[PDB]
Amino acid sequence: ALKTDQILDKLNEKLAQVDRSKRSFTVILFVHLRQEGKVVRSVVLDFNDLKISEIELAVTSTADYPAERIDASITIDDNDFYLVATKETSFAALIEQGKVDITGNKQAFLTLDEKFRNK
Ligand SMILES: CCCCCCCCCCCCCCCC(=O)O
């Protein structure tokens, strides 16, 4: 039971409203959610197909998303991800505070901050 579970419906709502025929931001982001310092759930934010889906726990790549296809990955506490998703903080602020680990293209998360704020 994650705080993040409480906000998934609202995020799916916002994804459903994105226009499908004029696509410009199509990154694949892996998100590894922590509770008490260990990864307890992993999800993919798939901006190509515009979906969020659960993946195998803590994995680096999958058959559908091989390594060369993943743009960036973030390890983040469940509570902090819920705060970003509810627009109470940003990825930029969490990076400034040392609260997250990001591999791959860090700029993808900073750009996501900017796109999400208008949605
Ligand atoms: C911070 C968590 C975000 C999770 C997903 C939020 C749902 C909408 C996010 C913004 C959608 C970006 C739209 C890009 C459209 C495009 O130009 O291709």
Residue 102 to residue 113: CA distance in whole angstroms: 14
> Candidates 3, 9, 11: which one to mutate for ligand 1, based on the most atoms within 8 Å of Cβ?
11
Atom nearest to 118 CA in ligand 1: 10
* Nearest alpha-carbon partner for 108 in 70, 59, 58: 70
**Domain ranges for the chain:** 1-119
3-state DSSP call for residue 16? Answer: helix
Q: Phi first, then psi: give them for residue 11, nearest 5 degrees.
A: -70, -40
Å from CA of 114 to ligand 1 middle: 9
Q: What is the resolution of this structure in A?
A: 2.1
Lining ligand 1 with CB less than 6 A are 11, 14-15, 18, 23-25, 45, 84-85, 112, 115-116, 119
The two structure tokens encoding residue 54: 């659960």
Other beta carbons within 10 Å of 53? 11
> What one-character-per-residue DSSP string does 39-96 give?
EEEEEEEETTTTEEEEESTT-S--SSS-GGG--EEEEEEHHHHHHHHTTSS-HHHHHH
Structure-determination approach: X-ray
CA dihedral sign, ordered 35, 83, 107, 70: positive
CATH architecture of 1-119: 2-Layer Sandwich (3.30)
